[model samples]
Target chain A: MADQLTEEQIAEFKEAFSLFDKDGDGTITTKELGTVMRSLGQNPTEAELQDMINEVDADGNGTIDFPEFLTMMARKMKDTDSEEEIREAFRVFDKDGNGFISAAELRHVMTNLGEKLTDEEVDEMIREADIDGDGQVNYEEFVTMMTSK
Target chain B: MDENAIRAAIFIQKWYRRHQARREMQRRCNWQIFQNLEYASEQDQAELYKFFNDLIKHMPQDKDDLVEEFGDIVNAKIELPIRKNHIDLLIDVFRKKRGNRLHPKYVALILREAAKSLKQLPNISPVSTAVSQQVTVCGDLHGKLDDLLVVLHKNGLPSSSNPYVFNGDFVDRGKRGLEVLLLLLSLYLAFPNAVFLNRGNHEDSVMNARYGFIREVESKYPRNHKRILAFIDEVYRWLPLGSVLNSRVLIVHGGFSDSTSLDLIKSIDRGKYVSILRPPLTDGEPLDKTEWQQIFDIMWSDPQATMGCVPNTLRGAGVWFGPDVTDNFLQRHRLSYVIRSHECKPNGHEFMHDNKIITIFSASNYYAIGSNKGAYIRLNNQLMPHFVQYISAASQTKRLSFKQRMGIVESSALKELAVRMRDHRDELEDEFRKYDPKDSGYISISHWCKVMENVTKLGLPWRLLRDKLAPGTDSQKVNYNRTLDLLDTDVILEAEADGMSVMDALYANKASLVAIFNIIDADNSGEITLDEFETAIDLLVAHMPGAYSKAEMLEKCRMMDLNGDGKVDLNEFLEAFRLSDLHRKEQ
Candidate 1:
């Protein structure tokens, strides 16, 4: 879990913002944001970057002004056990919620959720977290699987 | 360090960062602005053009009514010259600082008056004076008020006794574009006969949007930008394209093309041409091809030393006319020489074509190129040209050294110049072959300066400032091969000029040759002309550069014209290329 941004971290973030503002127009476009994010060791694809914009682009001009930038940084820095967002993401894959996809989903859960879980370790973990007593991932068990990953 | 010193250093560091932040915010406020042509209604533009048309007949009379009506709404600092009408506003404008404001209503009035005065003039305004007379002809001010004032001061102001024919390009690119325009308009209104303001390529609405004028107007007015911009753009329509002095000397912003004639230029309906660059006006009607070409040539064409007309690839519009074209145009019009100003010269002016075509530029440090001089010509009683030249006294910018500033300006300009040339690379190398004789790989540095600006349409002060050319003589050779190498990824791989087998492969088979020949023969007419050959080279080779050019193709196409008909039929095209098949292999 991540902690709140410190004074030093915020200063570093400001430095990063200034570096990406190539035209120095006091805002970062998607093109600028992608470069800065990649330089900060996060490779965000176009969809991921667009997702970030849709969340924080308060004015919706497809640019992240300083205020929106702070909102994004704070949100990313949150250690929210707040499962609301995680649960919302689960419905996207489990829209037909018959709990029918368990075998291929063991591969899906580790990769899409965040990290590449260690080999046969993921299958056993999915087995233990499969609380429906079948090859099914309910919201409760899905959250447990997500947190462990 | 001591504690006090450390604290003081930190304080200054924080303040400097804050200062940078504030400056950036201000810059963003004054960022690039464009008139949204898509959203702007045709009805609004239509009605506004009607305003200028009606203005030709009448404007609000009585000075009191002017103030009480749509007159008082502006940055009212300098009062209108209603009382002491003789050269009052001109003197006030000359004395005012760059930041000092002017009332928009007064500006509106001046523009309206200038438009009314200009509308009655012919396409080629004639300047005929009495015996023992001389008038000053100034070129391409391009919105530098300081340069205009310097001219006004050195060569007296526009008056009945001391007249001036300002040849086009009075606005765009500089900080004080509007003010420079207003001053000219005021002078035109003041002395209609003595002061002649011809329309330059920059005066159009589309040009104002591209250059700095749109931003200047938007930032200055902010609230009523459209009204002011429309008024000036309307006035541009009424401006004379060129002026002829004593019916012997011709002066235009740019030069004349091969088809250009004094009769054609004079008969042109100048007021109807709202935009010269394209067929259509912005949200307005279109022009015929003949009408567009004649108007475009007067305002945009440039003089080249070559002996025939060619497409001006550098400018993308206009033609790069040769000396013969000038001789022909001059002979047809019975004029002495043609004076043009679209291209800047190293010494502020240059003479070409047996001194019959004189090119002068009045905007020194043009496009911030270098410490080039600005000049004006005095055509006296016997039509003798006396040249007066000066440099802008570098008052507006910084304390940096010339080289430092030169390199700073040259870097971006050279980069853009490279890109523009790179896009037209096939034509660019053909230009090189013409400039460089005996395949030397280097060209005379003097020729490079003249050729590069005209070819790329980007200004570079290489003669005075840049390396190799800097402090270098006229006869020095510039390694254009290397210069172009830096521009593109042109790896020199082969030296085989053995009838060029690589090209022979293009005609390896009759079937292959027919496919190439058929596609270039658009309209499937069984023959092709120079126009079709030039346009289809892109379809023939999409992204490649070294495919030769229309000029080179012109030589080959003529040889293919066996019947001497000036066109290549399919039989002739096949017969010419089929011989290259023998060069395919030794076997």
Candidate 2:
């Protein structure tokens, strides 16, 4: 992470969000937003696109905003299902259910990424990020711990 | 003990453990291979041998082969299937020391120490040379010194008859990167006029953070880190960036990095001869924004090998295209062909938009996947590079035992120079004077190099001592105040002030959420890169089912993009961490 956003990164995100908010309306109906991705080359399934926009419209007014839009732009364009369902799937992998993964848990995940890790490395990442030594990480702790470290 | 000895001991122990771990891996692999070998038919054995032979060439040399040499046909190929598994198993062994950024020289030094397992690497000749009337091209060795030696032997080291171009990325990711660097240094020494080394993006501190090379050095030799880092810094300043042949081929480690005019690159004052004895940009000249961006994209380009440059991708900011990327880079510089390395190919070569551009990655078995032969290119005088393939030693099926492989790795030794801490005071003072020579100072602190040097010995990156330079916000001498003063001053003075205290500006805004969030979203997807919960407190990417088991958060990033769109869009990335009831049923 750097101290400031590049001029390009900031500009592009605004552009993409504007492009998707068709009709220049205060609220973009799911269908209006859906067509924008098609204009680009992305072939997100209609259902998937709808769900993606739904995640952005957090207040459920079927509308998105500057701050909420930014969060949606930065975080939630991938969901194809209800939040509860996605959360349930997350529960399956979040083994300790502390709402976050410890570093040791992260190392186990790395194996599938096709990298071989040593035992020492696997252990150290745990002790390093698990600042409280609670042996588990909550979602806030997980997010805060990994943001820079 | 002095830092060097401590580093050496750590190096020895780490490699000792690595070798032992490798041995155990081999034993397990051999047992599996024996069980399978019993059922394999003659053709299957031969077919299997192709994979086996390749693995054997990469295996550590062992005693059984020695015993067999005198009595029977040297069928080392049969041992390869087992050895390949061993190699794969070894990939799992890592020593993560998070939050540490190591200097390359110390990395090189400690690698020499911890790399007892070097005996197990591959058959690389030490400082060997090949000769031809044309040019010699090389690829990413990542401290695989022996593999590089094989390259030198096959292509030609820098010599009177041969002119060589090395395509950067020589350090990190591997155990003996420093030795590999030393060999290149020695080659340059021997053929000062002929040898050329281009700078790679990994040459900086940023790229090494996720990659394996930095961690290896830090764990293997922590004590001599300071000196090794300094020496490596020296080496970085010396690397000759862009090289040409016969006014035709434009060769570089990476590609058209910046929007800056080609002449700016051409006109860079390459500093003093000794200062440049190492490589490029390592001495902390604080790259102009464009240059830093160029370097950033060179190593961290978007879509990787997938597509041409696109914004919103990690590497999109740079001017990268297929054939178009090459032609643009060459034409602006009055060159013809653009030859580069960094992209991997299943075979040793890939041609872009006809033969206008060539991307060569020499590390065989790239990341131990993608079945590609490692290779180097040989150029004719006409400025054309003929792709020469060197199958990874494993791909060759030499059937080396673990010990034997280690022997081949050790055949080439790297002189891990002692770590040298720069006189920080002199460095800061010189930097200050360079940027602000006209400031009111008769015998001011600007020229007090000795006094500054004493301060640098306190040992911290620029961030720690930032406040001290100006004790109070109102102090005119404080960096920010000076920056404000420059606003009223002339353009050059402002530029000097800007350059002088750039680090302070960078450090000033540490709490902006967007800045912090962007840092974690390595994918540039504008969202978190992982689902850490479902995989749990212990499993990375735990929130995203089946995404666990990838090493480093980078791996999690790759998995987040399930549709293979090259990256996870915002909703997908955010939803990946979302554990909702509806999402569960679909999976």
Candidate 3:
């Protein structure tokens, strides 16, 4: 499994896993995996969820242990292009259905999604995303923000 | 250094200097006006002296209505001309803000008029809104004049077109009972058809005797003490127990029970009901299992979210009924909703049982936390309710934390969050049982967060919650029962603190514990030796206001040594502080 990805990729996957894990608990459960998946615009059904559990439950526990989840995320990334994933990420914060995001909307969604972001933190992120002083972010701007090194 | 940089600097300096120069020119003109007046002719001086002498005639008037004489009545003359008198007294009373005792005769006059009006009210005052007019329903005033005034200022004073139903508990528990009672009574007299003052458990003399109202009036009026008390007692006896808003909503101080009948209440004499608090049960007899169940239930019942009514062991008298009970009562009454008082809500109001049961609390910061937003409901002509919420100005300044200011999540909201999460404890356990097959009694913090989010389905930040429930218990694992115990609603938990100081200090300082450890263990192999531990405890206690001796320090270190290793790692050191913080955070 280590042969499939470089150290940077593994580190990146682990960070992403830590984020979706919600609690700093190293493992993700079936529901946890499905929720983050759906949030990122992959609305998998119960059967598909069962399929994920069977495929990713490396330790035969219902819990998607950290190592198991890391590989699944890595493998899933390789299978799908990054473009739609980026779009799905934008969709999560683009709450008003207007296809644009604002600092206000970011706080609203961040708080709702269980992220304890302060106003300055939310504003700084939006400032980074909204290159123009237009005070908002569209899909194109978001993809650039996500794609930036 | 460069020509462009130098030019930019010069350009900024030029504008700043130019602006200051212009500012000085403007400021210099004011003194120049006086400079022009250095000399005047003798005739002009004579005119000035004459003008000074003429102005002295208009200088002062000793008479004052704004400040009162010590011996005089704080009320109006004309022996109280009901409408003129009510308005006059209310303005006079309101102006005495930082300052009053109503005249003895004036007290009796206001009380007499209030009782006369109240005596005309039905057991359930059925009120209708004028065309598009609305009636504001205020709940559990609890003797806070500041809170009541906030409502009056926000919603406008009760009017014929506006109307207000003070849904009871208007007196007791506060020093402002004299003012609150006098104002409500005067308003009822001034706008008798519009203002509705319902009876609360506290309205009776029995409650006043135990609470502050009886003591307050005696202190307020040293003269004619017993007559004033008797007058107020007569008024409370006639206080309408409840009201119907356009017959669409049932507004009561307390909620209904299975045995609650409008007919029974309307038919029951107020004279016998006066004894509801005292007799309804005999001395030495338990009121919980008494024949006065229906009457007691009306005055004391609370709405529970479960099924069936039970003897309210929590309150010891009121019956706790479920949504099904609310539905049945609404069904029988042909009412769409039952708006009851008596409970405090974090948001000042909460709609429960699918919006059929609304509990509005107008007494903000009654718990002294100022965290609870006091609220009232405006029922428009169509009887559609709009909630108006405000925090007591005092509570906003005193009780709200930085987090509350930032997020508006009150302390009670923290309790509400825990209580809501507590409801799904079994579902959480079921998830753990299925996932933690090895029965480790710990789950991935990620798994716990996901499961809680999935179960509670609230917008609560589980990352923050993890810190709250079991902060630093483990990086990857949360003790299952520890989290459950913190979230448990049934437990006798008054944990008031959401200690921002310790938690924020630990979190902000936690980014690199190794760097911090180097201060304590400046020369260690990534572990705190006993010497480092001693120095660290001294450092912790230094700023925290105490000293620890060797025995006490060693004992503290022994408790904090999570892994039982003689040396402490950075993670262990961090957890030690966090675990200490978790206890402090609880209270």
User: For every model shown, what is its TM-score relative to the native structure?
Assistant: 0.43, 0.34, 0.45
lDDT of each: 0.58, 0.44, 0.61
Write model 3 residue lDDT over B173-252, tens digit each, in one string.
Answer: 87687778888887777777668878887787788887867777766655566777877777877778788775577888
Per-residue CA lDDT of candidate 1, range A22-130, in tens?
A: 6789887777766644432333568776765555665667777666666555664464524445544454435456644365554553354334544444544444455
Every prediction: chain A TM-score: 0.45, 0.38, 0.62
Q: Which residue pairs clash within candidate 3?
A: A21-B446, A23-B445, A23-B446, A25-B444, A25-B445, A25-B446, A114-B461
The CA lDDT at B400 in model 2 is 19
List where candidate 2 sits over 4 angstroms from the true fold: A1-149, B1-132, B257-260, B269-287, B290-309, B312-319, B322-325, B394-587
| Docking quality level of the chain pair in candidate 2 | incorrect
Could you say which candidate leads in lDDT? Answer: 3
* TM-score, prediction 3: 0.45
Quick one: best TM-score, which candidate? Answer: 3
DockQ of each candidate's interface versus the true one? Answer: 0.02, 0.01, 0.01
Model 3 scores a C-alpha lDDT of: 0.61
Backbone clash pairs for candidate 1 read none
Instruction: Give the fraction of true interface contacts kept by model 3.
Output: 0.00
The TM-score of chain B in candidate 2 is: 0.41
